[PDB]
Amino acid sequence: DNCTCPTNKMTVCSPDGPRCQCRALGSGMAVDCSTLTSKCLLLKARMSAARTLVRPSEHALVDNDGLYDPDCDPEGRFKARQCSVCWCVNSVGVRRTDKCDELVRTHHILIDLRHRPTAGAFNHSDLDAELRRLFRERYRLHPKFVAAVHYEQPTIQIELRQQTSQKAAGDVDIGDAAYYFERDIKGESLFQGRGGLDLRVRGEPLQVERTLIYYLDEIPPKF
Amino acid sequence: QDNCTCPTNKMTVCSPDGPGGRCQCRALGSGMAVDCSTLTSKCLLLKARMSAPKNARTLVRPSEHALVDNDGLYDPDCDPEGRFKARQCSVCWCVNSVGVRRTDKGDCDELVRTHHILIDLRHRPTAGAFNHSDLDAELRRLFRERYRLHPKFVAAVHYEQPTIQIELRQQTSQKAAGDVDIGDAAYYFERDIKGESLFQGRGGLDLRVRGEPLQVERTLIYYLDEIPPKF
Amino acid sequence: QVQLQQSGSELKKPGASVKVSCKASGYTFTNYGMNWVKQAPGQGLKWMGWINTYTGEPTYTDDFKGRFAFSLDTSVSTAYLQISSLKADDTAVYFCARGGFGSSYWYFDVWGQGSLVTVSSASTKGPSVFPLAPSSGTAALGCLVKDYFPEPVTVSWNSGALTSGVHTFPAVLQSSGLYSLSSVVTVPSSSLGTQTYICNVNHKPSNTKVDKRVEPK
Amino acid sequence: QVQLQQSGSELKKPGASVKVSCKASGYTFTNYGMNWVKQAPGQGLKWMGWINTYTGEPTYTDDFKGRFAFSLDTSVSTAYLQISSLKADDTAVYFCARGGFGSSYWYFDVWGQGSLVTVSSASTKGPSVFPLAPSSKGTAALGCLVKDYFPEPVTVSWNSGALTSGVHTFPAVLQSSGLYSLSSVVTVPSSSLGTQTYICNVNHKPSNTKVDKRVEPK
Amino acid sequence: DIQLTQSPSSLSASVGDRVSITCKASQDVSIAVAWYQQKPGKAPKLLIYSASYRYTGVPDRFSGSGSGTDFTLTISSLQPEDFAVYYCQQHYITPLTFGAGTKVEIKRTVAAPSVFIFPPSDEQLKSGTASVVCLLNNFYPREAKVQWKVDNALQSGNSQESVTEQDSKDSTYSLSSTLTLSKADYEKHKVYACEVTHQGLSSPVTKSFNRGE
Amino acid sequence: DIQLTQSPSSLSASVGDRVSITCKASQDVSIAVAWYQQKPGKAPKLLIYSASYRYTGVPDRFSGSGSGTDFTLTISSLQPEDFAVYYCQQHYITPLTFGAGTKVEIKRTVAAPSVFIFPPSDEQLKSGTASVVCLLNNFYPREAKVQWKVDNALQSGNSQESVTEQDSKDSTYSLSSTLTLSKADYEKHKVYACEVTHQGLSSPVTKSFNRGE
Ligand SMILES: *[C@@H]1O[C@H](CO)[C@@H](O[C@@H]2O[C@H](CO)[C@@H](O)[C@H](O)[C@H]2NC(C)=O)[C@H](O)[C@H]1NC(C)=O
Ligand SMILES: *[C@@H]1O[C@H](CO)[C@@H](O)[C@H](O)[C@H]1NC(C)=O
Ligand SMILES: OC[C@H]1O[C@H](O)[C@@H](O)[C@@H](O)[C@@H]1O
């Protein structure tokens, strides 16, 4: 009965237009709720949001590059330069230089999942069909941008491929689809009203134990 | 088991080729003799994993020019005691005792100890209810029994559904001889959570709180060193 | 052998409560959500909400909040629908139907057989049976079966020897809260003077059995 | 009402097969492993192996593999134990017992009641009943020897149940013939001999054998 | 809620025909549309999910297509077991919602109703109520209009209709219209007429009587 | 496999006694040792896991300690319901293994057996077999030796023993030893003797008979 934003729960929605209007948390930008939101704006939402949970020390180290509140352009893309210490980032916001003429697009993504061993049988055909269904239906990615699915039990790989010339105006970007998928796998749906990914293959609910994601840019990193 | 095994380290080769035909296990990728009744150092385990002969079959490898959200993996240099060498390298940096980079990359006077570790686990929401008391007792039991960590080094457990936190604390001065290091327990725990037990013959971690299984969806691990990192 | 087995038909007065059960067998109950779908008489399907069997959490819709409650007993793989403060437009078949835990699995692959819940203030009453007499080469004649509760009545003609050309209409619920139907048959008009036509009406809830002769007036 | 319910007792010939079921109720079957434990008559517990109900994979031990098979039907929350090429030393109670999937949960909290499997080439046979007569030479002892029956059990009473004090009916022994035998004895006052009559009432329901044997001084 | 506009509400077809049913969603739902079949007295059965994926065991003459807002269920060669009601459903977001249904019925040639009118019986009259019944027998297709006039005054709100399902032998419908009046109202008037409009009739048909004749 | 050496194999104790049962593992098993209790005809019940953790509902008097190779189950004050068999189990690695069990039995004062010998009946002899029975009645503790001599020759391999469970009234045991011979072997010898050694007897007791007396 109220306004929702199916493609972005990190919003506040009110019937304010001529009509539901949904604004992104942490920026206030109006959101198109019929397509995926850019990873850059979703990171700003995440960073703008503890009870007895402790916070890590500002001096703690992690085994990753560190989370940050990025700068986005008026179309919601990462600004090419992120910053005292500055660096260039690609279209999924990953640093590609050391600490920026253009925003280099990530045109190929490798997603490597390992699932928990399970009694229900399935094979590559089943996985290929199901993951392709999910990427079109849940992540709104056009079918041609899933390039390949690979399976060697218990590892699943999905290759996404989307060259600049092949991405039409309005197409969901593989980088945003990959981010929504990554968060879903970690038990955080970014959707509103769509439940979880709830991956099931040939009828078998699957549990993913480990996710690795590799990003390949149209221009190589300069390190 | 009918043949030799190494309960605390499956990244080994075991032979009844020891003195008097006794069992002996040696680490893969380094060759260090392994004590199969205590945890192997993280450094030597990383060397074993890097040495692992993968058969990709139809899986693809990431391109050499591909970027990752991580710092990247590498085969570390370990000292004769199995500790990370302070410097890791043609480009170089210093690491702390859990092998994490704590300086900028250059071209290291001490191995700075990681003395506090925060493990943050979010589990899948479940109908089964449990409280802090249950979780605290169960994680302490698992750290003592599975990882052989003394409970005095589990400094705290926190719980705000569905997020579990474990705080490990351990000064070098607090360690009796042979005590398991929190850095090694944390690594075995991390790999268990990712569905890769480093034990041989002990199944998975199989975390349950009231016998009811929990499914971990998201893991974060934070390392605090005895001196701050130098970036 | 994957199946959902629901409880039987219910008849309730306005203001009462009802609890419908849905017993799963042949699969792991907590691997799937349970959905509740309403189908009023002659109408389409309306989704009421669902319950996550793994978390126990119900989700209701705006039209089914407050006096509707979804619950579970996982130990016996059963889901329940409770409706309180019943009113007449709760009269419907209620289905339970299995789905997943997110939208790419929120189609329903396995369904219960449905539980009919009828809400009425009427009391059990047997029908009155009136002739629809053939008008003074084909004639029509019939029996009007009026003012009964609850459903059903059965109607036969000449104890089942006459079936050709018989139409027994679905019952209609009148504004009184009682049901009414007619049963008609077309016969050769030449047969009115010699063949006897009797409608046999049975209303088991009231133990009513009526044989009504239908003759030209 | 967390429960494991096993199938009933089995009697098989050497070379035959048996399938024991273990039905779980009151909990989610695929959340727990199912373990199989053997207990031969008079002996201790022996772990045979287990089956991971989530992955479907059985793990056997050196002593229980080959002609032992663990399987499942998760649709009816049931685990099965199949033993083929049965031999007499398979005679035992088999328990199913629930545990977890990793070693810090590999202790058994919920157990089935056990299924007795007896393996024998013997055919049904009622006992012969012989007197253990009281010595002709305080307290006397007398008895009935209940020899060469199959299968178990026999029941024994004295004087139709009127005599209970001082009765000992021993557990049966399996003889090398494959037939069971037991004795039932009673101690009585020496002075009662010859003024009190003593009759052992022996029932072997499998053969419908009913014997009343008066025991007298010879 | 997402509204689904399912068309047509009914269609007639013959065994062997190709049949298409459409579902229009009120906003873009990607490919998240399912289709179900339902027979009388039975639960719905899943046919298609995610617009085009056939559920296990569904005959391959059922197929689905579409994305965004417009979806189509196609039955390529209709079989007797396929005469039923079909529903689309969106599974894009909660609340999950359904189209209003499409009844697929058996095509036959046009048949005009035979029309009969029945006065109330004397037995009913003495009880206080008069039911007047107009019967439309064995007609096709279903669409039919029945109007009551009492001393030439068009009646509104005091009649109820009932219709059979298609006859198992000749695929026609029959229908009754029952006009209910108190005895007192019934005896205030003389001429009772029902007027039937149906496409197999060249002109509408009236059946009438005088009360007490 | 990890071998568990469980000690003692049996022990006699009184209600009120502190009872300790030990389990030694053949290699270091961390704290991964469980203890079970089993009564006749029943499944085992879990008492303790991970060496010291009481399972739900297990009374406070049961406790566990130990780590590495040496473990102990303690019943701080034995109660009437605690006479049973107890087993340790390691749950450190697969294959899971058990100790051989400890039977906890009721202590009472020493009671020597009454000893009786029974020749074969004439009826049995007609059948081709002779059973000779030696009875030890109402003795405590359980340990007893029964030896057969036939014309002074010690017998081996041709007897079987059976023992009752502790009597519910006086806590004693009774035992039979049955010597079985063919008729032909039985009639080759005259003197049949059973000799009973038991700590309640200052000297071993012989009961004997002559065949055919
Ligand atoms: C993967 O498993 C699927 C499902 O069992 C197999 O699909 C079947 O394949 C045969 C032969 O092509 C067809 O006749 C069946 O109709 C298929 N069934 C379904 C449900 O798709 C498939 O062949 C397997 N693939 C491989 C490479 O092993
Ligand atoms: C936590 O729950 C357990 C089990 O229900 C109960 O025994 C215990 O007292 C609880 N503890 C606290 C601190 O609430
Ligand atoms: O703490 C467990 C408890 O959490 C929430 O309140 C709900 O998800 C319940 O269904 C569940 O039983």
Side-chain angles (χ1 to χ4, degrees), chain B residues 14-16 18-21 23-34:
Chain B
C14 300
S15 318
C23 286
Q24 87 196 149
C25 307
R26 262 193 41 249
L28 299 157
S30 73
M32 304 278 312
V34 41

PDB file of all heavy atoms in Angstrom, chain B residues 14-34, unseen atoms left out:
ATOM      1  N   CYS B  14      52.452 -38.208   5.490  1.00  0.00           N
ATOM      2  CA  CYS B  14      52.781 -39.040   6.635  1.00  0.00           C
ATOM      3  C   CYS B  14      53.291 -40.388   6.155  1.00  0.00           C
ATOM      4  O   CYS B  14      52.735 -40.977   5.224  1.00  0.00           O
ATOM      5  CB  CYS B  14      51.571 -39.244   7.548  1.00  0.00           C
ATOM      6  SG  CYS B  14      50.842 -37.716   8.259  1.00  0.00           S
ATOM      7  N   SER B  15      54.347 -40.872   6.802  1.00  0.00           N
ATOM      8  CA  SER B  15      54.978 -42.126   6.451  1.00  0.00           C
ATOM      9  C   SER B  15      55.245 -42.895   7.736  1.00  0.00           C
ATOM     10  O   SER B  15      55.583 -42.284   8.762  1.00  0.00           O
ATOM     11  CB  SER B  15      56.297 -41.905   5.691  1.00  0.00           C
ATOM     12  OG  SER B  15      56.167 -40.864   4.732  1.00  0.00           O
ATOM     13  N   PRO B  16      55.096 -44.229   7.718  1.00  0.00           N
ATOM     14  CA  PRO B  16      55.606 -45.042   8.831  1.00  0.00           C
ATOM     15  C   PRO B  16      57.106 -45.249   8.682  1.00  0.00           C
ATOM     16  O   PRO B  16      57.656 -46.310   9.003  1.00  0.00           O
ATOM     17  CB  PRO B  16      54.825 -46.351   8.691  1.00  0.00           C
ATOM     18  CG  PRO B  16      54.628 -46.473   7.208  1.00  0.00           C
ATOM     19  CD  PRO B  16      54.397 -45.052   6.715  1.00  0.00           C
ATOM     20  N   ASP B  17      57.767 -44.215   8.161  1.00  0.00           N
ATOM     21  CA  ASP B  17      59.203 -44.201   7.921  1.00  0.00           C
ATOM     22  C   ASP B  17      59.959 -43.460   9.020  1.00  0.00           C
ATOM     23  O   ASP B  17      61.029 -42.894   8.768  1.00  0.00           O
ATOM     24  CB  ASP B  17      59.489 -43.575   6.557  1.00  0.00           C
ATOM     25  N   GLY B  18      59.408 -43.436  10.234  1.00  0.00           N
ATOM     26  CA  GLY B  18      60.037 -42.785  11.357  1.00  0.00           C
ATOM     27  C   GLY B  18      60.835 -43.769  12.188  1.00  0.00           C
ATOM     28  O   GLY B  18      60.942 -44.955  11.853  1.00  0.00           O
ATOM     29  N   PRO B  19      61.412 -43.297  13.291  1.00  0.00           N
ATOM     30  CA  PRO B  19      62.251 -44.181  14.117  1.00  0.00           C
ATOM     31  C   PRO B  19      61.432 -45.335  14.675  1.00  0.00           C
ATOM     32  O   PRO B  19      60.347 -45.138  15.229  1.00  0.00           O
ATOM     33  CB  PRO B  19      62.765 -43.258  15.231  1.00  0.00           C
ATOM     34  CG  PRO B  19      62.531 -41.852  14.728  1.00  0.00           C
ATOM     35  CD  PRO B  19      61.320 -41.933  13.838  1.00  0.00           C
ATOM     36  N   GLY B  20      61.960 -46.549  14.525  1.00  0.00           N
ATOM     37  CA  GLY B  20      61.196 -47.734  14.876  1.00  0.00           C
ATOM     38  C   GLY B  20      59.926 -47.888  14.070  1.00  0.00           C
ATOM     39  O   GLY B  20      58.954 -48.482  14.553  1.00  0.00           O
ATOM     40  N   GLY B  21      59.901 -47.353  12.850  1.00  0.00           N
ATOM     41  CA  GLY B  21      58.699 -47.407  12.045  1.00  0.00           C
ATOM     42  C   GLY B  21      57.560 -46.536  12.528  1.00  0.00           C
ATOM     43  O   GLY B  21      56.456 -46.630  11.982  1.00  0.00           O
ATOM     44  N   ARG B  22      57.790 -45.684  13.526  1.00  0.00           N
ATOM     45  CA  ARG B  22      56.748 -44.788  14.009  1.00  0.00           C
ATOM     46  C   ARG B  22      56.282 -43.850  12.893  1.00  0.00           C
ATOM     47  O   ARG B  22      56.928 -43.704  11.851  1.00  0.00           O
ATOM     48  CB  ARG B  22      57.252 -43.973  15.202  1.00  0.00           C
ATOM     49  N   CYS B  23      55.134 -43.215  13.120  1.00  0.00           N
ATOM     50  CA  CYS B  23      54.583 -42.303  12.128  1.00  0.00           C
ATOM     51  C   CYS B  23      55.352 -40.989  12.115  1.00  0.00           C
ATOM     52  O   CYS B  23      55.700 -40.442  13.163  1.00  0.00           O
ATOM     53  CB  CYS B  23      53.100 -42.038  12.416  1.00  0.00           C
ATOM     54  SG  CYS B  23      52.024 -43.425  11.982  1.00  0.00           S
ATOM     55  N   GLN B  24      55.618 -40.474  10.921  1.00  0.00           N
ATOM     56  CA  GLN B  24      56.177 -39.138  10.799  1.00  0.00           C
ATOM     57  C   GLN B  24      55.467 -38.412   9.669  1.00  0.00           C
ATOM     58  O   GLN B  24      55.209 -38.990   8.609  1.00  0.00           O
ATOM     59  CB  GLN B  24      57.689 -39.168  10.553  1.00  0.00           C
ATOM     60  CG  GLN B  24      58.097 -39.274   9.096  1.00  0.00           C
ATOM     61  CD  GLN B  24      59.538 -39.679   8.930  1.00  0.00           C
ATOM     62  OE1 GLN B  24      59.905 -40.338   7.948  1.00  0.00           O
ATOM     63  NE2 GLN B  24      60.374 -39.294   9.893  1.00  0.00           N
ATOM     64  N   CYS B  25      55.139 -37.148   9.912  1.00  0.00           N
ATOM     65  CA  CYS B  25      54.483 -36.306   8.927  1.00  0.00           C
ATOM     66  C   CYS B  25      55.334 -35.070   8.676  1.00  0.00           C
ATOM     67  O   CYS B  25      55.894 -34.485   9.610  1.00  0.00           O
ATOM     68  CB  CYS B  25      53.079 -35.916   9.412  1.00  0.00           C
ATOM     69  SG  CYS B  25      52.020 -37.341   9.912  1.00  0.00           S
ATOM     70  N   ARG B  26      55.461 -34.685   7.410  1.00  0.00           N
ATOM     71  CA  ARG B  26      56.215 -33.497   7.051  1.00  0.00           C
ATOM     72  C   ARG B  26      55.324 -32.539   6.276  1.00  0.00           C
ATOM     73  O   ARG B  26      54.421 -32.965   5.551  1.00  0.00           O
ATOM     74  CB  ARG B  26      57.449 -33.846   6.225  1.00  0.00           C
ATOM     75  CG  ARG B  26      58.740 -33.915   7.013  1.00  0.00           C
ATOM     76  CD  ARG B  26      59.905 -33.937   6.036  1.00  0.00           C
ATOM     77  NE  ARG B  26      59.682 -33.012   4.932  1.00  0.00           N
ATOM     78  CZ  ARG B  26      59.445 -33.371   3.674  1.00  0.00           C
ATOM     79  NH1 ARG B  26      59.469 -34.641   3.301  1.00  0.00           N
ATOM     80  NH2 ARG B  26      59.155 -32.434   2.773  1.00  0.00           N
ATOM     81  N   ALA B  27      55.585 -31.242   6.441  1.00  0.00           N
ATOM     82  CA  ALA B  27      54.726 -30.221   5.850  1.00  0.00           C
ATOM     83  C   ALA B  27      54.950 -30.141   4.347  1.00  0.00           C
ATOM     84  O   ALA B  27      56.081 -30.253   3.869  1.00  0.00           O
ATOM     85  CB  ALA B  27      54.992 -28.853   6.489  1.00  0.00           C
ATOM     86  N   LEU B  28      53.864 -29.951   3.596  1.00  0.00           N
ATOM     87  CA  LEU B  28      53.987 -29.730   2.159  1.00  0.00           C
ATOM     88  C   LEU B  28      54.532 -28.333   1.885  1.00  0.00           C
ATOM     89  O   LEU B  28      54.174 -27.364   2.561  1.00  0.00           O
ATOM     90  CB  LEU B  28      52.635 -29.894   1.469  1.00  0.00           C
ATOM     91  CG  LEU B  28      51.910 -31.240   1.532  1.00  0.00           C
ATOM     92  CD1 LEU B  28      50.425 -31.039   1.304  1.00  0.00           C
ATOM     93  CD2 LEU B  28      52.471 -32.172   0.477  1.00  0.00           C
ATOM     94  N   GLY B  29      55.393 -28.224   0.878  1.00  0.00           N
ATOM     95  CA  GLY B  29      55.862 -26.931   0.424  1.00  0.00           C
ATOM     96  C   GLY B  29      56.990 -26.320   1.228  1.00  0.00           C
ATOM     97  O   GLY B  29      57.667 -25.411   0.724  1.00  0.00           O
ATOM     98  N   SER B  30      57.209 -26.770   2.466  1.00  0.00           N
ATOM     99  CA  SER B  30      58.386 -26.383   3.239  1.00  0.00           C
ATOM    100  C   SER B  30      59.243 -27.569   3.646  1.00  0.00           C
ATOM    101  O   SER B  30      60.473 -27.484   3.585  1.00  0.00           O
ATOM    102  CB  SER B  30      57.976 -25.594   4.499  1.00  0.00           C
ATOM    103  OG  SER B  30      57.397 -26.436   5.490  1.00  0.00           O
ATOM    104  N   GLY B  31      58.630 -28.680   4.049  1.00  0.00           N
ATOM    105  CA  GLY B  31      59.376 -29.819   4.533  1.00  0.00           C
ATOM    106  C   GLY B  31      59.621 -29.837   6.029  1.00  0.00           C
ATOM    107  O   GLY B  31      60.216 -30.799   6.535  1.00  0.00           O
ATOM    108  N   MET B  32      59.195 -28.802   6.748  1.00  0.00           N
ATOM    109  CA  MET B  32      59.381 -28.769   8.188  1.00  0.00           C
ATOM    110  C   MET B  32      58.660 -29.955   8.810  1.00  0.00           C
ATOM    111  O   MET B  32      57.506 -30.235   8.473  1.00  0.00           O
ATOM    112  CB  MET B  32      58.846 -27.452   8.764  1.00  0.00           C
ATOM    113  CG  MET B  32      59.444 -26.164   8.166  1.00  0.00           C
ATOM    114  SD  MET B  32      61.050 -25.690   8.860  1.00  0.00           S
ATOM    115  CE  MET B  32      60.702 -25.841  10.618  1.00  0.00           C
ATOM    116  N   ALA B  33      59.357 -30.682   9.681  1.00  0.00           N
ATOM    117  CA  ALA B  33      58.690 -31.701  10.480  1.00  0.00           C
ATOM    118  C   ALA B  33      57.551 -31.050  11.247  1.00  0.00           C
ATOM    119  O   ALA B  33      57.685 -29.927  11.742  1.00  0.00           O
ATOM    120  CB  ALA B  33      59.690 -32.357  11.438  1.00  0.00           C
ATOM    121  N   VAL B  34      56.405 -31.724  11.315  1.00  0.00           N
ATOM    122  CA  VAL B  34      55.235 -31.146  11.949  1.00  0.00           C
ATOM    123  C   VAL B  34      54.868 -31.966  13.179  1.00  0.00           C
ATOM    124  O   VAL B  34      54.830 -33.202  13.136  1.00  0.00           O
ATOM    125  CB  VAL B  34      54.056 -31.039  10.962  1.00  0.00           C
ATOM    126  CG1 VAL B  34      53.968 -32.270  10.102  1.00  0.00           C
ATOM    127  CG2 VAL B  34      52.750 -30.810  11.693  1.00  0.00           C
TER     128      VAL B  34
END
